[PDB]
Design an enzyme around this catalytic site. Sequence first.
Site, PDB file in Angstrom:
ATOM      1  CE  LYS A   1     -13.461   7.069  -0.561  1.00 10.97           C
ATOM      2  NZ  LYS A   1     -13.111   7.329   0.873  1.00 10.97           N
TER       3      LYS A   1
ATOM      4  CG  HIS B   1      -2.131  -0.894   1.030  1.00 12.02           C
ATOM      5  ND1 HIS B   1      -3.286  -0.512   0.386  1.00 12.02           N
ATOM      6  CD2 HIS B   1      -2.326  -2.173   1.428  1.00 12.02           C
ATOM      7  CE1 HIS B   1      -4.143  -1.517   0.394  1.00 12.02           C
ATOM      8  NE2 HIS B   1      -3.585  -2.535   1.024  1.00 12.02           N
TER       9      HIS B   1
ATOM     10  NE  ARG C   1      -5.232  10.178   9.902  1.00 10.56           N
ATOM     11  CZ  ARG C   1      -5.019   9.189  10.768  1.00 10.56           C
ATOM     12  NH1 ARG C   1      -5.797   8.111  10.773  1.00 10.56           N
ATOM     13  NH2 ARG C   1      -4.022   9.278  11.638  1.00 10.56           N
TER      14      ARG C   1
ATOM     15  CB  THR D   1      -9.743   5.227  -2.401  1.00 16.36           C
ATOM     16  OG1 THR D   1      -9.560   5.574  -1.026  1.00 16.36           O
ATOM     17  CG2 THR D   1      -8.969   3.954  -2.720  1.00 16.36           C
TER      18      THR D   1
END
EC number: 2.4.1.1
Lengths: 813, 813
Positions: free
Chosen positions: B657, B354, B546, B653
């Site tokens: 959206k 990741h 974040r 991601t």
Amino acid sequence: QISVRGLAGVENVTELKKNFNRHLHFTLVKDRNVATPRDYYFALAHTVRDHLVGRWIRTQQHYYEKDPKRIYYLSLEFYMGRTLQNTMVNLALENACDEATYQLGLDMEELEEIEEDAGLGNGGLGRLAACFLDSMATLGLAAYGYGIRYEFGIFNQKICGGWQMEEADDWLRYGNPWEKARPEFTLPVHFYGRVEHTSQGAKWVDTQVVLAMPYDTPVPGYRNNVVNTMRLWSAKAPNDFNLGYIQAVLDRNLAENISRVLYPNDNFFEGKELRLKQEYFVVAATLQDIIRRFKSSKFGTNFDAFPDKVAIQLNDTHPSLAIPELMRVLVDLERLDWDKAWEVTVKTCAYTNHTVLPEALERWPVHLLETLLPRHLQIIYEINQRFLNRVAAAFPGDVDRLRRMSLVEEGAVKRINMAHLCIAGSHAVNGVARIHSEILKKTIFKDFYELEPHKFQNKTNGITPRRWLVLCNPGLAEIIAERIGEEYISDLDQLRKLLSYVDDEAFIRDVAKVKQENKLKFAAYLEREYKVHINPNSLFDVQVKRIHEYKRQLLNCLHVITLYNRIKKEPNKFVVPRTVMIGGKAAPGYHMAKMIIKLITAIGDVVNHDPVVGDRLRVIFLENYRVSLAEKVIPAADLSEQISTAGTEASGTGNMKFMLNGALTIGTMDGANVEMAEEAGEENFFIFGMRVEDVDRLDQRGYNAQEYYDRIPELRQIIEQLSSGFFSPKQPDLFKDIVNMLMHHDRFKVFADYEEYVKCQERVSALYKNPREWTRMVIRNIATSGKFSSDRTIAQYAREIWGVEPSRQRLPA
Amino acid sequence: QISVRGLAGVENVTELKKNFNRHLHFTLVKDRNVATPRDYYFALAHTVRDHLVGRWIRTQQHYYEKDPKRIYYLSLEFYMGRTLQNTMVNLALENACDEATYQLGLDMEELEEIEEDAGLGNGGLGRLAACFLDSMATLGLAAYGYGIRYEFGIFNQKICGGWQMEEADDWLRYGNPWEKARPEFTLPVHFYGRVEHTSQGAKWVDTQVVLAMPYDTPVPGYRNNVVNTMRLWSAKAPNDFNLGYIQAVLDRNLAENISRVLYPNDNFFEGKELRLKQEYFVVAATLQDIIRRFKSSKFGTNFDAFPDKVAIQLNDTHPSLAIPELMRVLVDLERLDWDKAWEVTVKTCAYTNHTVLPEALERWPVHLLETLLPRHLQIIYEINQRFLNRVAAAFPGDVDRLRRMSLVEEGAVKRINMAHLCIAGSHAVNGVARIHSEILKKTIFKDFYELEPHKFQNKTNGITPRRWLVLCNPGLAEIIAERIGEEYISDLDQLRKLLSYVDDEAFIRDVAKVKQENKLKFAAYLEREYKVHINPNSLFDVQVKRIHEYKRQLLNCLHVITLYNRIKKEPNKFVVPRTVMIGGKAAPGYHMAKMIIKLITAIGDVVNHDPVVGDRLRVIFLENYRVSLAEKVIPAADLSEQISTAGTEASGTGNMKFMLNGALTIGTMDGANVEMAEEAGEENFFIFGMRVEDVDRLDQRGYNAQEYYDRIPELRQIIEQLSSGFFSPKQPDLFKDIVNMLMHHDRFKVFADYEEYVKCQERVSALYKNPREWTRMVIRNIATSGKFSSDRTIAQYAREIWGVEPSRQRLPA
Ligand SMILES: Cc1cn([C@H]2C[C@H](O)[C@@H](CO)O2)c(=O)[nH]c1=O
Ligand SMILES: Cc1cn([C@H]2C[C@H](O)[C@@H](CO)O2)c(=O)[nH]c1=O
């Protein structure tokens, strides 16, 4: 099957079956192919629970409309046991559920055994609270039980190598279908901090906050559609608690430890800070709830009417902080003057004492209260000053009385006497049996009785005939119902009608038949669950209760050994066969009690394997004694051992359970034994030993155990056997502590009652040889046990303390 | 009301209303007179839950009968958000429940807001797992999510004085209606101990035992009647744990701390023992469950077929201990030879990486593993030896390759590289976007790619169109459905059909209308919930993710200040009005990220109250960013900030959206931005800044921030403003750390992209001045977002890694 278990209607059975299947599917998320017996238990529990809620909601609605005086029973212990069968009995659902489950291909009795005991108590005090909740609901009182939801109740007892081992009672593991969490009614509780003085009086500041989250459990009355509430508080940390990051979250446990575990001490005070936190936690949350409910009432701001709408019953001194907490709230928050607040407090609070043993009395170090509850200590000091001014005015110049009556005890460490606090701040103080209440007035609270005689009362303890007859002994309940009807279940005095059947040959046969059936059932239980073998034809001699020096399990042990020695001496002589059963838990830190358990198993190890003894004598230690085991062994008993030293057992309640269930009693004139013998007639009881007055005489002269050892050869032999290692060949000195105690420092005078005890036991054996006359005496016991219903007890509290009238009237269904 | 929300049949609405009333009464023990909105939420949740269980039971029954290959998705994070609306959508119940609640006099949208987020994740990695569960169920795969049931999820963020404050996320306080405790399937997990060698191989002994109790949550597929399971483990102490008495019970907390709290670190490795315990705990319990289920199957003892029936997907290296644990079980317990066990392990396990950031890589100190998991360390050493023998044979004499590829890292402290372990023990290794997977093969895992090229794959991330379109943006889902039907919801590629409407004047108007409605709704939410005022006519410029240095919230800050300074310089000049919204949580220990949050609020404090600025510029920090807030702000956005330094954001991601919801993207060519721009066409994206190759060139030459400061007067002014205390008048040096970092130690080259960023932002403002052409570009984005459905992603995993075929076929209802 049997009449007392209600009707099994076609409509009801069909409805139960479909709701059972609904819960299995939707609630448990299971189908019949994967479901275990535990799943089946839960589906039944949820099905029965559904029948409660309608009545629960309308009972509480009814109290809101009618606004009666409310009774708040404060206790740190509620020894509830299992709830499923009790709920079925009280709702008249037992036969219907039995039929519904039978048709689904399940045995309901098997499902019942899956439920965990709610073991939130130690023994008598905790079980009394449970019986009281049942009776208060049955008598239609607006009553609330308030306590702590312990995550771990009384430990499970395992016996390993003859020794007690403790394990955590993780009773909530599989969930509790009976409780309803009420996180919406969470209340803050304050600890530590300091007292600040302003123009507007005192202020308690810089406190640590712990949240109190309530869980509500329904308490159904016996077939009256009344469902009361037991509310238990759970400790929760606030969300900003200690808020590196990870540690602060993990430290939340510190706050939540308050409701983690029940202190496993029976009749013994341990002055630990966590216990004090528990005591304040329950008191502070409860009083906020009480006041909230009082303000939000269809009545009245005006605290003059507070005692007309509220009664608070303190179960022992454990919730004694209710007194200064009520003062704190009234004076500091509501701004009432002291004198008025005090009048309200006294008229609201009442105190029940449960023991005279000095080691059980709560005497909290001032330094603990100073740190934890600084405002409460100040209030206690002020209460003490004003109280002692009253004593001084009533008894001028009596300076020793002043020191004796002070709530503050002077010494190396200053302590607060919580019992003195309770008497000062309560309008009623009661003991739990006539002899106990008399002892309170004559000895430990003599000074207080002289000052305020009107305050002192008696309320003899009782037990609920629902759990302790109908539930645990359906066979006996049925044969009784055949003769006199069903009304006795909520009016136990009706059992007197059975005296006209003492010469009835049919009844005699039925009583004896029910006992043998109970004995066979218990003999089978012991084989299936513990692989132990007993003779069901023997006399079932049982002593079940917490292990204590005062309860004298050791006196029982001496008799057992006497019987063994007599058999070994004359092997071919006939003796009435006995199974001696002793059970009960010892507090983990109580060394002597743990040694007594070891002794009992050690005696069994010798006696049970001696081929010469045969099946004439068996000694079995009943492991993990608890409410559910009591419901099994008590109906099976022939002989009830109630052999405490006269003046030590305040009441006892186990004694009453045995009387109601067809056992005869061997016992001292102690606690409720006196009233039991009075009710049945002394000829129908096996009374022996010193009376209170004889113990006092021996104390004045000085108890010398050596005297008895010297003059009783049979007693001497036992002591020699113990000392030499007869019962512990590999560890010859194993029981040296026991022998030393018996010979040199026996507070409870075991030796002094030995001779009379053994002789009395001979008379028991003689009567058991005549089955017909044994049973006739049994009938005379059962028939006169009516006074010992907790319905009677609660009716007396209601009328003589709380100022409310009981009611047998049904609420609409 | 709207078509996509299903049918509101008379039969269904009547049935829902009565089941709602049943739950309120029987389940919640309330009536309409005492019920709060929270009670109403729970009654609805239980009502909808009932519709799941039937399908849940038959789905799991179906898997037992058909015995397909099972997919086990192992993750320490499942960022689920709220469950009520998602469940209604997937079951086609939304309109029916809306009607049923309306008829009961309740607003369903109000009830939805009461549900707590299941915040069991940090950000992208945790949310990816949640999207994946949804897609796997929708595609009919026999899939299980396995993780930890944290008592406390990601902390709730409060902003106080401009600073982040953390508070515990007590998400279970009121209960969780969606989970089902399964205490019957509790499994033991071992820690510590030592390794014993016998004739029958190694034995792990003297271990401490912690129990793993599973809680199951249903995962419904989109309208296919498939309901899969997410199983989360909870830590429980055994009943003999440490078994003075009271302390031993209280010490149970030590064991139960394992599942207490989620580590709140995003893309950062913290080597704490508790975290390692969490990682092993999930792995050990899960693997036992997997093996149990494999043995109890309608297929076959023979572990040759294990990889044919089981796939294990490792979400990052967090569950990497699955590899040596599987070896442990196969070798030590099942007695398979090493080579065979290893073949099975490799064919079973696959690993998803990741990130390439070195501070995020898990490198566990050997001494920790030595103490905690002594047998696993031995197994890892053996894996390493055999692996390095393979490297040595393939690249003879290449001694530096051996040290580079070792699972054991040498140094002051020896460490295990968990990423190296994962590659060695997995048959497939994938990155999460094309550029990321290429970087893995070219840089950090180059050596491994050279040894085993076939192992390395790409699986570009995706998001579920159910939650991220239908649920959060019903208005847009509806106008799309009007034109092209409903099939696109489970076949997102169909959105391409919308390209034929880019010149349709009706569609253009509707797209723009849906956006304005979303903006108004969010503008109102901000007033009602946070008392902040925004202009709904302004461009909504949003960066939500974040807080990280690599994500360059600081670059955004520089632009905001540039805009402010330009306004102050020419006040009477027209500028396109903007609302700049920045939100996201910082890890509690991440000092720089906490300083960035303070900076953002400090800019707002100046900008928002400057009368000369007016409503032309507003800077708002969005507090407590989480899944439920994302569902509100994303549909409201005009501009999506995806501005990480090229080569640092593996995929992202959030970017997807925003694309699906009608926002245009300003961003670097990083992560999935590259594929997004490729899909829509570069003309329809606002791409700026260095490419990966430009960053590399700058690194070789050496990044000098002073150069930019010297040559850009507008940049110089901002730095001077920061340094002198313009944004902190009371604390002039408050932002010295930020300035110092920017000027001297900026790993992420903020200054290097400043000029191109600002110019690109000017082009954004220019287009927004032309509403029709803005919207046409939006339509071109939405229409080409199909590739970024997690259905596509999961279909690729299924076919290329797991060896299973997806299915859109309905199960019978
Ligand atoms: C824990 C415990 C200890 N003890 C011990 C402590 C005292 O030293 C002794 C009583 O004199 O017994 C009890 O009597 N009861 C108990 O419950
Ligand atoms: C908690 C935390 C700290 N840090 C700190 C620790 C390091 O000293 C620095 C990265 O060089 O930032 C993070 O980068 N991310 C985090 O999540």
